[PDB]
Amino acid sequence: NNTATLCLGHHAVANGTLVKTMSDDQIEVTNATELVQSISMGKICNKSYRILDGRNCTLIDAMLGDPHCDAFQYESWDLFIERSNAFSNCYPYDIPDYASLRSIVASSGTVEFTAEGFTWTGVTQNGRSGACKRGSADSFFSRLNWLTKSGSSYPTLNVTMPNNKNFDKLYIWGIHHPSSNQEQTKLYIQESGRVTVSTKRSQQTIIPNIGSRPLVRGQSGRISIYWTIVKPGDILMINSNGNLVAPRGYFKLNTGKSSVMRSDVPIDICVSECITPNGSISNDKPFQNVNKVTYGKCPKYIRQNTLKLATGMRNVPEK
Amino acid sequence: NNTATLCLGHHAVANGTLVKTMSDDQIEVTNATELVQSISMGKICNKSYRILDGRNCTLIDAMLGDPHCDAFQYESWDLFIERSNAFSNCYPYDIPDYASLRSIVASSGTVEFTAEGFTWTGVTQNGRSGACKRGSADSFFSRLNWLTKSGSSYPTLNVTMPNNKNFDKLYIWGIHHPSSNQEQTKLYIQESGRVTVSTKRSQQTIIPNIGSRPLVRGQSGRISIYWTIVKPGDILMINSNGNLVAPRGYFKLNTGKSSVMRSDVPIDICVSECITPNGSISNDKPFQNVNKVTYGKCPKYIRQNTLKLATGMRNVPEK
Amino acid sequence: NNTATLCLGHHAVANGTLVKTMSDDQIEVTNATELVQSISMGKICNKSYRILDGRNCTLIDAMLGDPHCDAFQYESWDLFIERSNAFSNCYPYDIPDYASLRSIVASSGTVEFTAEGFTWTGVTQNGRSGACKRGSADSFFSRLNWLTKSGSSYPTLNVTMPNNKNFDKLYIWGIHHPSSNQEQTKLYIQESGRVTVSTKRSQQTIIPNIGSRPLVRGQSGRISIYWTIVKPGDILMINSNGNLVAPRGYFKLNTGKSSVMRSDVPIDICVSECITPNGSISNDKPFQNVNKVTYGKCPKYIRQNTLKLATGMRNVPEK
Amino acid sequence: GIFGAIAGFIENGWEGMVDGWYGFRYQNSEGTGQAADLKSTQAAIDQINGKLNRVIERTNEKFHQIEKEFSEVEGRIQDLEKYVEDTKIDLWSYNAELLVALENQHTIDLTDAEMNKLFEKTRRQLRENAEDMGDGCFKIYHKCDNACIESIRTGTYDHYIYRDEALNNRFQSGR
Amino acid sequence: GIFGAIAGFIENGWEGMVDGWYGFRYQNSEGTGQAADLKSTQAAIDQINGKLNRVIERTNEKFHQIEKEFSEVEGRIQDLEKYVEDTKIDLWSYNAELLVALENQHTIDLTDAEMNKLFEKTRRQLRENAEDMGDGCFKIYHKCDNACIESIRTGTYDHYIYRDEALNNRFQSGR
């Protein structure tokens, strides 16, 4: 003609997508992205963090030295994996505040043991049981040391062991709960035992309770387990006139980044920076709906399984 | 004329209202709505959830069977209501970790009991007291069973009771704390008692402490109360040679949506989906300033008592 | 000319500053303000709140009356300051649930004591030790009262003390743990002691454990410390036939705004409304990055150390 | 408002407009009249209706929890029970305060934008045949009876038809 | 959108524009054509790219924590362990929901503003030599071949040059 027309516009795509705003419940935009990691990898990646499979062993049992867990001595970890099918296979026991001891050792990130030369004069050491058979032979937890009488003597034990190393020592010890009064005399000459583990700061005495419990691995007796933290320059002092299940040394506590996690998922040769009981999952998104239980560099757990963030203008097709 | 004028505008109302924005502390809009539920109904609605009025009874007392709480046997609930004026009226007692046991039973949502045939040979059963008089007669908690000596014999009790039912049994039992050494022998031949309730997993022994306490319902003696959870296929084993206050059976734990709540407000024939100690309140708003303590489908508790959300444009009158 | 040009604009400054928005990572505005209090005052201001310097004393030790802490009797506080170099200098002891007792007294905001006339017939009072020498003389905690045998008699003690005052009394008492069986008889005729502190509501008995602990201030014996809250119209009843470390009276619990805080920073003559272990800090900002531990009218602790809020338009210079 | 329409170039609101939220008044050869605009009104309402539901999800059942009022002084555990609850309430209180300010700020600018959009839309129809008077009113330089006005109100006004007439009327002057 | 450009006075988007996000179509003496505008496109993208990073900081390592799944019924402590976790999840869930709505609302108005800005910028160049047609299209009252069009697209169009021609063409009429 003798004029000209100049039109202004913007683009559009064939594959538009719905997102929410403050103004609309649903509105089509040119493009958007998932902010919620919904899918898990199905396996726990072996690589980025140091993963340890407990297999048939719990964390607690591996550190006490239940014979069928001997493999786990020497081992450290970033993440210890506890399986459902795991079982104890040694002297039946309990731990007042089990959950806390488990938490403490999990953080330590190792069950490496450092033996110490305790002297137990008057008594006989290395008491064993049919409860944990190391091989076909009677045995006991490797990290503990069952003391019984010698001759017809169980003298008031009184042993001292200083910490000079410059870190905290964690000592694991216990007391034996026999089934009958006839047993309490038989094994330890006195009619009632006592264990007084002490330091300067703390001090804790335990009287052994006595009587029949249910059979577990042909045994109605029991063992109760306690721990003591011994600060540098302080000292451990164990006083007892019966029933002591003695320590053989110490664990080293670390201010570690280590943990434990309950899962049945298999471990595999992939790579990832975040771990749930459902398997490794991906970092790239800000949120995630796989599991509230996580370890490592993980997105934030929320209730919703999808959240779409628009990455383009409104899509306004013609037809 | 030979032209025309066309004016554009918007509306206004006589009854404008102030709200806050990011730009102004106060600004008048055409309309707005309360987002904060400030008003309570003044009564707890009987209907939507199953409400149970404890009246003179605490949750714990109803489940132990303090005679004046016999009415509450057989009862389940969504919400148990505990009143201030409630009182105990039976043997004086304590419960180590009372708060937790209360929490556990509140969640269970019932105090229905299932009796079991325990055999206590050697001893005499159903010991009673002037502390709880069922009628004008001496009595004791209905759910517990006080064992004392027969002839001049209190033989080392040893009873076993397996769980085959396929759910957790909750057993409630206790130990008796006599006032004098003369009493400890008189009732139970031994000079010191002991109770060792055990399973495979757990085990807990209690030595009875002895001496004078203050009088309460003509009694300086006491009773301490413990519980044991017994998983399916496990077994309960009670060993004792003195002072046992025995269980008569088990409660059934449920993974329920039930709770307990402290309130003095009356119950009434209205309907509501959310409950506070101040009475039922309304769902329709997102927040609420009535009480941090709530049960059911409740708005979120915040500090502020009013928040106005504008539902119209700015009101701009003329004059 | 015969026309005129009228230009519209806005202002600009020489000293522009960068801030973040939702649209840009960095953008220069005319002015902005710090929202994060990064700098501490370096000292704890003496003024606005009532500050108390524990110096060589812990809160617990000041209230037990470790002789070198006599100065702190009579003192109340808003904030008690505990220093690292503080030390105990009296009979060696422990407190089951130390942390809680410390929390309770810190809230009370005072260690003012109110003596009471307890009658201990049969025994001798005010037992002392080389562990706390008040001056060069043997002594003991001022707030406690060590009972030992008289003649060759330690009769079953049974003392009663009612609360009529109309507030809670907090009683602090304990039990003695001797080093040898020879000592347990020597000091208290019986071969095993017992302490049963009771009220109507509660009741707690403690058997003294016995044996060698490490030396601390020429002593292998120990003392364990417990407390009892006694509601108005209730009554305290102490029953014991050995080892009682008796109370001399009560503390008054207050529903106070008081606390305790661990810090080595010095106190000084300035003014402030918010306190961290790093020293007083300023109120004027909404957030703060000095310390998660705070007391008083404090900004909110966050991870980031700077956050700039723009207080002007975009600065758009020419050149 | 950011558009400076409401409380701005439109000096005030119309109390006598109950038809809708936005609209027209006009004077012409047939007298004076008034009419609401449905689209703009509806646009505004659909954004404001259920506005809060887009952020706060339908409120949920919660049952047994932690105790929050205590009979006795316990120390450590109770300190933590209280702190947990105290922390939660404060975080929600912040949230509600912020949510109100955002939404309300959004509601204002939204409604100002709807006013401005309707004015601008109207102007674009009139083209060279009208003058923006500053009131939010248009001086239309031709005879425009009610059917002519309706045509503007329904988007069907054809400026070419009236151009010639408007040009005469506009340029009737020039010193 | 608040600017009423996208989905507004510009009736729809251009599927056949793969060059960029905003742009021009034109008809003139040399035929028809199309060209994207880089600045406006880029302005929009730079705001949308890494948008979320301005609020959520690079996600952080966390190691040992609290247990969250329990084998046995414990009462008080476990009640609190659960409540703490439950409270945290709900607070984060609220946060994510709100964050999405804000950002998305912001992303829309942003893109509508870029459209409007480009239209307004273009208009201001044309001055008295063009007419706003309502489509988002300009009727240019002179011969404007491709070099003339490019000059508009690159901000170098000089209206004085064409004024006289445009005036003839505009005022060719008047009843």
Place this chain on the structure above:
Amino acid sequence: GIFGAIAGFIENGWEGMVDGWYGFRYQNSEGTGQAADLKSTQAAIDQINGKLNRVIERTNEKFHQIEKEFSEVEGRIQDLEKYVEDTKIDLWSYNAELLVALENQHTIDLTDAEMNKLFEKTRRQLRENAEDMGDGCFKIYHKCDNACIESIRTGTYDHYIYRDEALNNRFQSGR
């Protein structure tokens, strides 16, 4: 900015304007001059002043709480004490980050809107007697001394008075 005024059609800010935040410069028969606009300046400041107070309430006293630094390793309870605190700090940290971005985004668009509003307000006064030059400057087609300029600046300019003169000056041309 969404209005494309600041950093947009107004190429830059005026360092030599200390009177206020927005304003006019002008050249005319009496020379050149400059004047701030108080209303627009004040509008902007009143929104920015105490902006944060509309969301964060006056900060509150808090006294005894939970311990947050531990001498010994305790396990379960301490794990929870730490997690509670850790969770609280992270939630507040998110909040502060978001709050800053919102407010700052709001502060920008606010100030851009005040610029645009003042330009648009000014234009509407001038009516047919001026031309938008693109700078944010107006070519006024008549003699407009300082009293004439002040009248624009104070909203009292009457375009009818100057229309005839402006028409002569505008239409002095046409090929």
